[PDB]
Structure formats: C-alpha cells, structure tokens
Design brief:
This is part of a larger assembly, with one copy of chain A (130 residues), one copy of chain B (44 residues), two copies of chain C, one copy of chain D (159 residues) and one copy of chain F (104 residues).
Chain B lengths: L3 H4 L37
Chain C lengths: L4 E9 L4 E8 L6 E2 L14 E2 L1 H4 L19 H4 L13 H7 L2
Antiparallel strand pairs in C: 1-2, 2-3
Chain D lengths: L35 E2 L3 H5 L3 H29 L5 H35 L1 H14 L10 H13 L4
The chains are: A little secondary structure (130), B little secondary structure (44), C alpha+beta (99), D mainly alpha (159), F alpha+beta (104).
The complex binds magnesium ion (MG) (4 copies).
Chain A binds one RNA strand of 132 nucleotides through loops.
RNA sequence: AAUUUAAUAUAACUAUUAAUAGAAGGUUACUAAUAAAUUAAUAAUUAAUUUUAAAACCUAAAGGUAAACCUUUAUAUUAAUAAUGUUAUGAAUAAUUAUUAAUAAUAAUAAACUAAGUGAACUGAAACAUCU
C-alpha cells in the first residue's frame, strides 16, 4: 500500500496527477541524449581548443565596474516632501535633444556658469525651465 | 499570333529610392549588371 | 449635504503636493468645496534621500568636445545591435540596386 | 563541531544582504509607502554620471535585499503581502528612469556636436558669442579671463 | 507555497489567457472566489478591472 | 620553472596581498548591470565558510566573483554552480502543462 | 425625490444595404520602460498635428543546429595622438588606459479576391468507351 490512507483503488496514480499531456514543450538542459547541449547564454568567452578544451579570451569576459567614490547619501527612493519636479522646454521644438537648447545651456555655462538651477536651489519648486 | 504567356507575366514594382531614403533591410551583395527585362524570366 | 459635485478645472496644490481639480458644487461654481487638509508626514526612514541634497544639481552641460558618458558605457545605456534602428541610403547604394 | 570556535566578524560583507542584521523586516521596520516616492526624470537630469552610477548600485543593493525577503516569504510563508515586491518595483522604476536620462543626455551631446559641425551654424553661434557677451566695453576686467577659460574648455580641448 | 515562479515568467500564453478571461463569463469565476473565501474578508461589491 | 597551477596560486596570493583583485579583470565593462542575486540559507551539507546564491540563469561563474568583489567587497575563492530542473506543473487538469522555471 | 418602458458601452456572431480603407505570434527572464513641441477654449486643463527614447531570444536564407542555442572580440580592426608600463636599444616600437577619422551588417510579416501552367475521378448517360 503506497499510500496508507487509500486502502482501495480510486484511480490515483503512483505519482503525479496525469500520465498524459502535451509533449511539444521546448527542450531544456536536463533532458535529452548525452550528446545534447542546450546552453544558458552564460559563456561567450574564449575558443574551444582542437583537443577539446577551452581558452578564456579576457577581452570578452564581463566585469561590473563600480565608481571609485560612491555617494552614500543618494538613497534609492526620495522623501515624499519634495514635489515631483517637471521640466518645460517652451519654445524648443526638439525637446531636450534639441541642439539650440544645448547651445543655450553652454551659453549659460559661459556667462554665470556652474550655478545651481532654480529647481536645485529650493526643494519647493513645482516646475523648472529646461 | 499574340504573345500571351510572355505578356501575362508580371513582376514586383520596386519603389523609387532617393538619397535621403530609408535603407532596405536586405540588399543584394553585388551591383546590378543588366537592365531588368520587362517580362522577367519565365516561371513555367 | 451636497446633492451633486462637479469640477471645472485643474490646479497645483502645495498641500496635497500635486495637481488637483477644483471641487465645486453642481450648479453654483462660486461655492468651492476645499480639499481636506492632508495629515502631517514625518519621514525618518534611512532609505529616503534628504530633500536638500536629493535635488542638489551636480551636472552642467559644459562641453561639446567631451562625451558626458564614457564610450564603454554606451552599450549599457542602449543596444548597439538593435534591429529597430535602420540607416539611410546614399548615392552609392542606389546606383548599386538601380539597374 | 561547535561554533564557539568561530570568530564570524561583525563587519562581514554578507551583512549587506540584510537590513540592520535582521532576518526579515516586519511591517513597522519597512519604509511606509506614504513617506516615499521614486525619483523623477527631471530630478535625475541634475545629476552627474558618477552620482547616477552611485545611485544605480545603491538601488541594486537594496533590490538584492528585498529579493531575498520576497523569496523567503513566498517560498516558506506563502503570504501575498508583496510589500517587498512593490518596493522593488518602485526601485525598478527609478533604475530605468536613470537609464532614460543617460541616453537622452548622450543623444543631446551628439546632436549638438553635429549641429555645430555645420560651418554656417558654427559661425553664427561663435559670432553671437563674440559680439554680445565678448568685446564688451570693459565691464568685465578679469571676469573675461574666467569667461575665456570656460570657453576654451567647452568649445575646444584647451584646459 | 514554494514554486520559484516569482523569479521567472514561464507560461506567458497560459497566464495571459487565465488573467484575461472573457468578460461575459466573469460570473463563472466570481462564484468560485466567493464560495472559497471566509466571510470576514469578502465584500458584496463587484470588482473592477 | 614552476607549474601552471603554482603560478595561479601565486597570482591569487599576490592579489590578496596587494589589496587588488585575486582574479583577472575582463575587458567587457558593464557599467549599469541589472542582475540581482538572492542569498540562501545554509544547508546541512554546507559549512559556516560558504554561501549559496540564486544567480541569474545567464551568469558565468566568473561573473559572480566580479559581482561580489566590486559591489559588496566580498571575495569568493571557489565558486561552483548547481543548475536545477523544472518539474511539470498545472494549476488545473484542463490547462496546458509547462515546466517550472529553471533556477541557477 | 423614486420606479417602468425603448435605444445607446471599451463588451458577441450571422445576413442585406450605405460609406471609408487596403492590417504580429511564441520562449523566459539581468522583465522588453519614455520624453516633448505648436495650435484651438474655460495659471492650469483636454482635443488635433509634429517630433522622440527603450524594445531580450526564436519564427529557412551572418554561419550552424535538435526554435527561443553555439561560433562571429563593432566595448571590434586600421591610423593618429597624451600618458603609463614597456621592449627595443634620445628616438623607435608595439601592450595597455583614454580621445578623434574610416571600415558593418539584423527578412514572422497574413488569409480571401485576380491571372497563368498542369489537370483528375466519383457521378449522368438508368450498362459503357464518343459525351458529361
Ligand atoms: Mg535523460
Ligand atoms: Mg557543472
Ligand atoms: Mg552539433
Ligand atoms: Mg452511368
């Protein structure tokens, strides 16, 4: 008696629920002949050797670079007491990518540059130009 | 006589491309060498 | 009690902290029903950036010769091998395809 | 084997996978939704690449912590509170907003360079700078020295 | 309830079909959810998509 | 003069001594990764000196070493991968059967 | 102030009549997101036009395969430069870091209608072959 709480035959399978179903599901790595090789897009580095080995090409390996100095104060969220700033590009057809806006921005940087914008000066401003 | 099986042949009408036009996704790898025949190659 | 209520426009409310409509009684628009006063807020969580430096501007457009983003960072910003980005034609290409 | 023989340090890096050395944050400890709001695209535009880089990884680190808590909750307790999931989604919103700002910024720089590459537009912009703010009636004496220093740095490669 | 489903998105077609049930047949599912929940988290109002 | 394996050991020792990577940094730089890893509670077959993670499926063994060192400062000496299977599942017998996600 | 009746919805198919026009699926994941401008009316707000970002893998034809997989260093090659190390032996020289010019590629893309080639048999002839 595989299941002591089922003394008589009720149609229950030895395991699982149904013995039949779809077989056209995509192949995975754990299933197939010993010569099958699915892969997990986790190795595009190096060149298989003629004998059957591998040689890491270190100009293709992937490395995650973090800034040397990390700003700890920038938390992932933002305090709710600062309103969501909005930007207006009135008179600029191309929007933030518009070249003449860039020219104006460098113009301001020339004459009285490196100056905090209106939105940065106060945490209570609702829209800002640019 | 009339040339029914040569006249009835039809070929695709390629669009006219200007220099300031979108690049087709797939293009031949070799320059065209002959003017397109009006009726194309017989398909039969 | 108020039978029915309508709205006749929108405005920015520094109390609700966002844009809200005007809530006027149906009929007379002069009688305006104010939105309720929001409850006080006290942010003490360490995962919230302080307002005074969250908004503090650090970047200025001060160059046309140096790319603000290093070249090796472009792939992370966008896909270089994008199928949706198609180029334009030239005189050479047209002559190549026109019989 | 006994753990009394160990010296597991208090500064051990894996502690960054926990919130204040807690197994799983409770409701009170979790940041409330009212007090919080994800960044806005305009706000990120006022940030340097280094700062945006710093924000990205700070977002990712807490994303790992929240992911660890979601998995523990949804694989053992089975509760559908999904408070951690919502927090992670809010961080995910900021992460792509950062990505949008960088792309728009890079495109803007390229567009400006191309626009200034045309001789007529470059000459107009330069002469406008020359006539209006430069060649003043000596109102700036040494300020123009600064003006030029930023001029060479921006338009050209002279530092 | 360990399923590892939250870490991936498998069965997109089936999930979409289940989550986009025809609106004509919602009463079929509404009865199912109602009969299978305790009375102290159930409201007598219809849901909203 | 020395075997390859001895040289590998020397490089790792040199990296730790100089406070630098104990591995070789590749040339493909990812500036804004979006991969997340889940810490897992120890099993009986583990020791207090190990840690198990649920990494992304498309994640090399080298990738985790760099991921830990550069983002967290943790140095992993030996890293080993266990990729699990996905059992067939169905919320009801009327729906199509599909495999559960594979978790690396 | 409430109720009934008939019609009207993002939320059915079929038939006729009138008008207008000739258009993504699947797999699972490091999830596959947007930004704006001009005009028209009560500082704001909708409508119309224009611009704009991202968009993983497979769907014969970059190559191959057992579809969502592997090889193709476009984060690439050549050239130049500043520096480092650095061989070579001040200069050179490549290696590296970082800039600028040139060198390059992404086919799922419907069905019905039309035209052309080839072209049956069952069946009717109360059988059958000319014929159908
Ligand atoms: Mg087997
Ligand atoms: Mg193995
Ligand atoms: Mg093979
Ligand atoms: Mg007959």
């Amino acid at each position: 008696l595989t299941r002591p709480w089922k003394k008589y035959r009720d149609g229950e399978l030895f395991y699982g629920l149904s013995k039949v179903g779809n077989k056209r599901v995509p192949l995975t790595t754990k299933q197939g002949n010993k010569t099958m090789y699915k892969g997990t897009r986790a190795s595009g580095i190096g060149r298989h050797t003629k004998f059957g080995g591998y040689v890491i090409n270190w100009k293709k390996v992937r490395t995650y670079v973090t800034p040397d100095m990390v700003n700890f104060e920038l938390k992932p969220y933002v305090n709710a007491n600062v309103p969501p700033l909005k930007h207006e590009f009135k008179g600029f057809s191309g929007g933030p990518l518009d070249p003449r806006l860039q020219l104006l921005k460098i113009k301001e940087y020339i004459v009285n540059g490196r100056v905090q914008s209106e939105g940065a000066t106060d945490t209570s401003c609702y829209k800002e130009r640019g | 006589r009339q040339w029914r099986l040569i006249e009835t042949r039809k070929i695709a009408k390629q669009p006219n491309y200007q220099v300031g036009d979108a690049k087709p996704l797939h293009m031949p790898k070799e320059r065209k060498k002959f003017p397109d025949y009006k009726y194309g190659e017989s398909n039969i | 009690a108020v039978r029915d209520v309508s709205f006749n426009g929108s405005y920015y409310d520094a109390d609700y902290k966002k844009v809200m409509p005007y809530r006027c009684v149906k009929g007379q628009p002069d009688l305006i029903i104010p939105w309720p006063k929001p409850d006080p807020i006290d942010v003490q969580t360490n995962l919230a950036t302080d307002p005074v430096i969250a908004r503090e501007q650090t970047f200025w457009v001060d160059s046309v010769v140096r790319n603000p983003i290093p070249k090796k960072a472009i792939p992370s910003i966008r896909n270089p091998h994008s199928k949706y980005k198609r180029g334009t034609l030239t005189a050479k290409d047209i002559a190549k395809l026109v019989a | 084997p006994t753990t009394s023989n160990l010296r597991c340090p208090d500064d051990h890096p894996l502690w960054q996978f926990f919130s204040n050395k807690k197994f799983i944050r409770s409701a009170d400890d979790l940041p409330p939704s009212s007090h919080i709001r994800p960044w806005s695209i305009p706000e990120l535009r006022h940030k340097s690449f280094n700062d945006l880089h710093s924000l990205w990884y700070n977002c990712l680190r807490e994303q790992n912590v929240l992911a660890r808590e979601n998995h523990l909750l949804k694989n053992i307790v089975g509760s559908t509170h999904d408070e951690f999931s919502e927090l992670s989604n809010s961080i995910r919103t900021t992460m792509w907003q950062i990505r949008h700002v960088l792309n728009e910024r890079e495109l803007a720089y390229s567009a400006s360079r191309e626009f200034l590459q045309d001789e007529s537009e470059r000459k107009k912009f330069l002469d406008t700078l020359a006539n209006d703010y430069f060649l003043n009636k000596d109102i700036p004496d040494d300020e123009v020295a600064s003006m030029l220093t930023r001029f060479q740095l921006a338009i050209f490669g002279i530092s | 309830s360990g399923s590892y489903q939250h870490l991936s998105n498998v069965g997109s077609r089936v999930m979409k079909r289940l989550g986009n049930r025809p609106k004509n047949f919602l009463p079929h599912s509404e009865k199912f959810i109602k009969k299978s929940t305790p009375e102290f988290m159930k409201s007598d109002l219809k849901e909203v998509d | 003069d020395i075997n390859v394996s001895e040289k590998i050991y020397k490089w790792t020792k040199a990296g730790i001594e100089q406070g630098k990577e104990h591995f070789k940094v590749g040339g493909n730089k990812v500036y804004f990764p979006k991969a997340r890893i889940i810490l897992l509670r120890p099993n009986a077959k583990h020791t207090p000196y190990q840690a198990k993670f649920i990494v992304p499926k498309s994640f090399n063994k080298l990738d985790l070493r760099d991921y830990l060192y550069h983002i967290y400062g943790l140095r992993a000496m030996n890293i080993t991968t266990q990729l699990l299977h996905g059992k067939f599942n169905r919320m009801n017998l009327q729906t199509t059967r599909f495999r559960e996600p594979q978790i690396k």
